[PDB]
Design a protein around this ligand. Sequence first.
Ligand SMILES: NCc1ccc(NC(=O)C(=O)O)cc1
Ligand SMILES: [Mg+2]
Length: 297
Amino acid sequence: EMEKEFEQIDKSGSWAAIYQDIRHEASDFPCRVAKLPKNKNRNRYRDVSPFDHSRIKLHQEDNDYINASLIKMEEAQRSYILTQGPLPNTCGHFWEMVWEQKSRGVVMLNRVMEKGSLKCAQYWPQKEEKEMIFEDTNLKLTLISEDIKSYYTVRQLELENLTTQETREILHFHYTTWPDFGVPESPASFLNFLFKVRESGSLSPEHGPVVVHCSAGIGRSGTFCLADTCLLLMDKRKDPSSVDIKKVLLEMRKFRMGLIQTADQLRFSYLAVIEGAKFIMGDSSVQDQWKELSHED
Ligand SMILES: NCc1ccc(NC(=O)C(=O)O)cc1
Ligand SMILES: [Mg+2]
């Protein structure tokens, strides 16, 4: 199992090598359209692209490209869209994806500024009064409310198709205390956050796939999905032992490159899943322990 494996890797200090095998075994698929000249300003990082086979296509004549991938987890029956943080020129496309993909939730795992640089455009309105309009995609976005907690913030937004005057409620779950290439403060705050997302219905199959992003859409986003999928599988067969994390991760990496960016992010994934297993297997009290230990208020 994973807990025994976790200790075996730990007490030998071999996470770097376990993580490197994963890196070495990971799928390599082509990213032809990401690399087209006409798409250079649509990509935040040169070395982070969506595979053609799993990329999300914008529904438009002109240019249907966005740096976003559908990760479709067959056995788990969960899909996620992983994407880079929007660029000043792709905030319209981003909100277009969300509309067309019928997404209910957006999980943001980074801050707009980290380490003195700009990791993501300010793609949602910070004030109720000052809604945003995306003229290129004919979408309007309004802040309806927010709930600021100590290390994450939840917002309600209303997205309007200005063409059909049709509106939707989107939930924005914003984790504000996770350093790029880092890990969360502890399993508890991460898990408390994950279960907040779940409790919202954002991950439910009656909606389009959740949009998950960090700066690149792979390190912190990969960590989130991996843990979520792993806990889901464990829940579905109520068998902690049947779940092989490394194998789930390799499965996810068929759909987008680079998922989990450091060995420590891998170790943390193990950690989060092992701790989340408690709740899955019938210990309802741990959720309240996570809320306390997270120091939410
Ligand atoms: N080195 C390219 C590169 C740049 C940024 C990232 N960030 C993330 O995955 C993240 O936001 O966690 C990952 C890879
Ligand atoms: Mg105000």
